[PDB]
Amino acid sequence: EFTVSTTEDLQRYRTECVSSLNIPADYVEKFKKWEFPEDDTTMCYIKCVFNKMQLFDDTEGPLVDNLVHQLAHGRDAEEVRTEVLKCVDKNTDNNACHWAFRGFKCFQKNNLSLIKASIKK
């Protein structure tokens, strides 16, 4: 049961993660603008959202198949997969928040986005 997350899913997951992690209001407003400071509050927020999107498991780490489904946005699955796998590492400091964010950073660096406009004809 993997389905891709939309904008609406992300807004929901954001609300859930904000409240469950008691995110201060300064951060909330940044996260609504998709602005992510590299600090521990943000790293657990990102883990939390990825968990809910089924992109990240705290034990297994980044979930490649689901990430490929989410991040392809119509692109060649095989090519998106090889890029994703370059972003996948091990839980070196045993901190799943740090682990999720590291993946996030690599994705953004490689221009893989969770959400992308879709044109349909």
Residue numbers in the entry: 2 to 122
From the paper:
Ae. aegypti OBP22 (AeOBP22) is a member of the OBP family of proteins that has been directly implicated in regulating these feeding behaviors. AeOBP22 is unusual in that it is expressed in multiple chemosensory tissues, including in the antenna, the proboscis of the females, the thoracic spiracles, in the male reproductive glands where it is transferred to the females during mating, and in the salivary glands. The monomeric forms of AeOBP22 are similar to other classical OBPs which consist of six α-helices stabilized by three disulfide bridges surrounding a hydrophobic pocket. Our results provide evidence that fatty acids are likely natural ligands for AeOBP22 and that the binding of long-chain fatty acids (C15-C20) is enhanced by a conformational change in the C-terminal tail that is critical to generate a high affinity binding site.
The second crystal form was solved in the P31 space group and contains nine molecules in the asymmetric unit arranged in a pseudo three-fold arrangement of “trimers” consisting of domain swapped dimer and a separately packed monomer. The dimers are identical to those observed in crystal form 1 and superimpose with an average pairwise RMSD of 0.47 Å. The individual monomers superimpose to each other with an average pairwise RMSD of ~0.2 Å. Ligands are observed bound at the center of each monomer with residues 112–121 forming an α-helix that forms one edge of the ligand-binding pocket. No ligand is observed in the dimeric components. In this form we solved the structures with palmitic acid (C16:0), palmitoleic acid (C16:1), and eicosanoic acid (C20) complexes. Saturated C16 binds weakly with KD ~690 nM, however, introduction of a single degree of unsaturation at the Δ9 position (C16:1) leads to an approximate four-fold increase in the binding affinity (KD = 175 ± 41 nM). Dodecanoic acid and palmitoleic acid are strong oviposition attractants in Ae. aegypti, whilst the saturated C14–C16 and C18 acids are attractants at low concentrations but repellents at high concentrations. Therefore, we conclude that the domain swapped dimers are an artifact of the crystallization process, and further discussions below are confined to the structures of the monomeric forms.
